Amino acid sequence: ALTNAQILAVIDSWEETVGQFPVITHHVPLGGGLQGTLHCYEIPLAAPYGVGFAKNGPTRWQYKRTINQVVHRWGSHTVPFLLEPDNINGKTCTASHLCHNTRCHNPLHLCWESLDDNKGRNWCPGPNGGCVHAVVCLRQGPLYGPGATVAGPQQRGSHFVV
Amino acid sequence: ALTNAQILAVIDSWEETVGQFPVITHHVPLGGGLQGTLHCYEIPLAAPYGVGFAKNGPTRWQYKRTINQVVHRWGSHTVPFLLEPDNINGKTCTASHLCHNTRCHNPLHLCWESLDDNKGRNWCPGPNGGCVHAVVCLRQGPLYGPGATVAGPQQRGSHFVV
């Protein structure tokens, strides 16, 4: 089993490599009509991606290191959290982008939480619009808003009450 | 079926059968520290479910009718919206429970919207807690809250900024 020192070494080599990714400045809604700035460290669109990185899906990557002749591989956004509990309330922990930008590997833009918590950030009003996430959102969720519902609740007869 | 008359007949028959489903009262959070009452028309747990209904999944049902000697079948919650566009902005329209209760077939608890709009209601603060859905929520979403994030954004070195 990899030691804590060895894991810290993986985390450090990961940070070293990701820190050299292109840094892209994005202006983002914070909620409450305010705008803020996020700096994403974006993995390249095509190979080569950086030492240890490889693409396993359109918006999926993995980080790989070989330690004492054994190959180890992790989801590319999971590496910052290798020393954290990997489940909570019986739910698997997932890497969760506070910037909602999959290519970003900035660990200051990631948290470690259930898939439900993760998904729900998409509709959050944002840190200046009423976010109640204990680990606060960095921005308003991209899907926040009135929605585009096509048809509302309705009945033709009188069989129902709300 | 194809004709408006035939579609109205399907909707009316569906409403008549669903109108005989047991009415179950559910007290629900509305947001803002307030609570309300919903009356769900709940499909039975086991066969027989009602004329035209059959279960295709633990929480999935279908409605079927024979028109012009041909069998026509729909997802059991889609029938109220058979006269509505089946897509919006190129995204498939889905039946969406405002009461977050799958067994419920009360059309006054259903809306017709994209899967994203549908999902996002799970985290809405609710009609008295700040819901901005244009077709308003009937209750606070069951997943609204601070979440249970295990680890927040963090770095070991000094390569990153927010």
Place this chain on the structure above:
DNA sequence: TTGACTCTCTTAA
């Protein structure tokens, strides 16, 4: 040991 591909899987609407 490393890169660049390949494949399938999870969850809850």
Place this chain on the structure above:
DNA sequence: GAGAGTCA
């Protein structure tokens, strides 16, 4: 959140 097939 969906569609469709197999039997009786």
Place this chain on the structure above:
DNA sequence: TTGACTCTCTTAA
């Protein structure tokens, strides 16, 4: 014609 089962699929995290 109607009922009661079976199977796999879609989406975007």
Place this chain on the structure above:
DNA sequence: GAGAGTCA
């Protein structure tokens, strides 16, 4: 949002 195989 994930894990794992192949080949050189």
